[PDB]
Design a protein around this ligand. Structure first.
Ligand SMILES: Nc1ncnc2c1ncn2[C@@H]1O[C@H](COP(=O)(O)OP(=O)(O)O)[C@@H](O)[C@H]1O
Lengths: 373, 45, 130, 131
């Protein structure tokens, strides 16, 4: 049989990698590059200049931590090369010269980004073939249905695309820059209100952990504010890494509520439910009925407990009464963008889709626009 | 060429495990441990 | 939180198992390779994670693979001499064009499975027996 | 109104009755014909409409009739894998200069009665069978 291709999902927060045809990724690690801050007085220690991946997260106190990807755009490329090298040689122990590579991209972004990835992967890693696919198309592949609207939300970018019977509508693709990192920064700014202080890059990871453990989307916001003001039954206690104990309380559901009211961050954009409804409304009249019943959630940011009920309630409020709304939220949705990719490289006709080495050599790095959607 | 000891280890690294899978065992897609739901026709039959 | 529980459930099971089986078979193959290459001198490795911790095994492996002389390993039971012994082998790898990421001497000393497995895989792939 | 009600009566009775009667008899005939060729690979179908959705029965029938082995079916139980297998069968049918129209993969997968019957009719009529 032919060599199984490598499915590599480059998210804004985490990087995932695995083999095509598997049901789960084989290596998951944060996409963080850290560099030393203080001075080293011990002679004979390690002289490594850059910590990458989980090793950078292991030692946060003496490092300044940076993200090579922000808002779905690569800003530093040497750090990306380090990320990909650690993914290939260390996390998987594979030879990249004998494996096709599939990559994952947000729908709307700078164009040159694509070229750079291609220009890297044919040159430094010498892969025989590579391909780039949109996140939400792979999510719809992993959903198992051909017709639906895909709403995806990670740490860098939120985007909604409609697809009817395998046909995409490019004018109805909507992108929003409110994502997980904005929620983390808002949680920091709102945790300042209780007297707790977090300022450094190492403490942002602590705040992110607090958000993942103790945040939920309230079904009704004003009623929840009245309940939290009336009683203290909503409070929870968290333990800091240095043994301090903090109490979140009212800040548990105010941070995710910013996904539906972007005026909390000063943004004048609309909420995610309004974005989904507007992306549905831009389509043709006939295909709306199938799109209302096939809404799919994806990405880690949609893992707040209670997001599905709130989204269904708001969309049902916006939509006409005679139509019925179904929100499809699979329990393993965090890896859906990977899983569909692992499906896509296993198809028979996808062997006719690859950007070969010879084609790139013939037509330069601008070939990726002709082949990839 | 001119090294026959470790290129077989390279060939062993291509499969998802370092060992080739058993021909008798079915693939990951059909083993009913796949997380994605199947089609309506197959589940109906 | 049944969906979050199921997400953590899938994370705890399938990713960990699929990584563990690959890691086990890879380290079993690597032990055979390093034992076959270290058998010329009077040396043997019985555990990949523990025998490469101290550093004499690695410097002797680079001695036999390069066929070319290396500096005296420092002698001492403490951690600092162990860091020195790993660092000298890492520097020798740094000379002969082999490119390493996320490699520190304290990573091998502490015993991280991923990094020692990646180092052995890089030795197999990019280094020349010559 | 009443004239429209009479027109609806006429169409719903006569057109639907005649179409369903002819289509039922042709379905029985086509099933009886295809089972004879499918018996040689020890495969049997009960309902023509539902057992052609997966696509393995179609590719095995073409395997019987052509005498040349086809590309292997994709390993899956999804919708897209059924679309792949039906597309492979239809590509082989296009390969042998048999002309088919209004016949996509999703038509066979979704189980349209008229298009499945037309595909079987074209296989019976135009295709070349060698022994
Ligand atoms: N269990 C959870 N509950 C709530 N939010 C979560 C949970 N897990 C992750 N998140 C949020 O999702 C983000 C990770 O999303 P991820 O899927 O890594 O995005 P991408 O991979 O597309 O960059 C984290 O920043 C965190 O804010």
């Amino acid at each position: 049989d032919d060599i199984a291709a490598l499915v590599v999902d480059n998210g804004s927060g985490m990087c995932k990698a695995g083999f095509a045809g598997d049901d789960a990724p084989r290596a998951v690690f944060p996409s963080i590059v850290g560099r030393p801050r203080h001075q080293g007085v011990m002679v004979g220690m390690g002289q490594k200049d850059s910590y990458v991946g989980d090793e950078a997260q292991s030692k946060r106190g003496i490092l300044t931590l940076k993200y090579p990807i922000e808002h779905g755009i690569v800003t530093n490329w040497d750090d990306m090369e380090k990320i990909w090298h650690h993914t290939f040689y260390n996390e998987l122990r594979v030879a990249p010269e004998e494996h096709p590579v599939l990559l994952t991209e947000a729908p709307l972004n700078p164009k040159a980004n694509r070229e750079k990835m291609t220009q890297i992967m044919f040159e430094t890693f010498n892969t025989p073939a590579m391909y780039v696919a949109i996140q939400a198309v792979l999510s719809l592949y992993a959903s198992g249905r051909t017709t639906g609207i895909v709403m995806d939300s990670g740490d860098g970018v939120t985007h909604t695309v409609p697809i009817y019977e395998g046909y995409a509508l490019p004018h109805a693709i909507l992108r929003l820059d409110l994502a997980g990192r904005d929620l983390t920064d808002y949680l920091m700014k709102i945790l300042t209100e209780r007297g707790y202080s977090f300022t450094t890059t190492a403490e942002r990871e602590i705040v992110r952990d607090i958000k993942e453990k103790l945040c939920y989307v309230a079904l009704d916001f004003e009623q929840e504010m009245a309940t939290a003001a009336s009683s203290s039954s909503l409070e929870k206690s968290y333990e800091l890494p240095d043994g301090q104990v903090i109490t979140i309380g009212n800040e548990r559901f105010r941070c995710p509520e910013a996904l539906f009211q972007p005026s909390f961050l000063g943004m004048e954009s609309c909420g995610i439910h309004e974005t989904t409804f507007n992306s549905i409304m831009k389509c043709d009249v006939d295909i709306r009925k199938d799109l209302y019943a096939n809404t799919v959630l994806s990405g880690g940011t949609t893992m707040y407990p209670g997001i599905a009920d709130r989204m269904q309630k708001e969309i049902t409020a916006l939509a006409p009464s005679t139509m019925k709304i179904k929100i499809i939220a699979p329990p393993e949705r965090k890896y859906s963008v990977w899983i569909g990719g692992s499906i896509l490289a296993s198809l028979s006709t996808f062997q006719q889709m690859w950007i070969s080495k010879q084609e790139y050599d013939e037509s330069g790095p601008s070939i990726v626009h002709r082949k990839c959607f | 060429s001119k090294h026959l000891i470790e290129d077989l280890i390279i060939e062993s690294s291509k499969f998802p495990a370092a060992q080739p899978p058993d021909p008798n065992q079915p693939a990951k897609i059909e083993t009913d441990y796949w997380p994605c739901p199947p089609s309506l026709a197959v589940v109906e039959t | 939180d049944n969906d979050n529980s199921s997400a953590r459930l899938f994370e705890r099971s399938r990713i960990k198992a699929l990584a563990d089986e690959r890691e086990v078979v890879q380290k079993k193959t690597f032990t055979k390779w390093v034992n076959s290459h270290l058998a010329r001198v009077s040396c043997r490795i019985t555990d990949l994670y523990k025998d490469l911790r101290d550093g004499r095994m690695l410097i002797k492996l680079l001695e036999v693979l390069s066929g070319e002389m290396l500096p005296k390993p420092t002698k001492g039971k403490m951690r600092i001499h162990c860091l020195e012994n790993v660092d000298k082998a890492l520097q020798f790898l740094k000379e002969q064009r082999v490119h390493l990421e996320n490699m520190g001497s304290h990573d091998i000393v502490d015993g991280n499975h991923r990094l020692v497995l990646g180092l052995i895989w890089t030795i197999i792939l990019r280094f020349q027996i010559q």
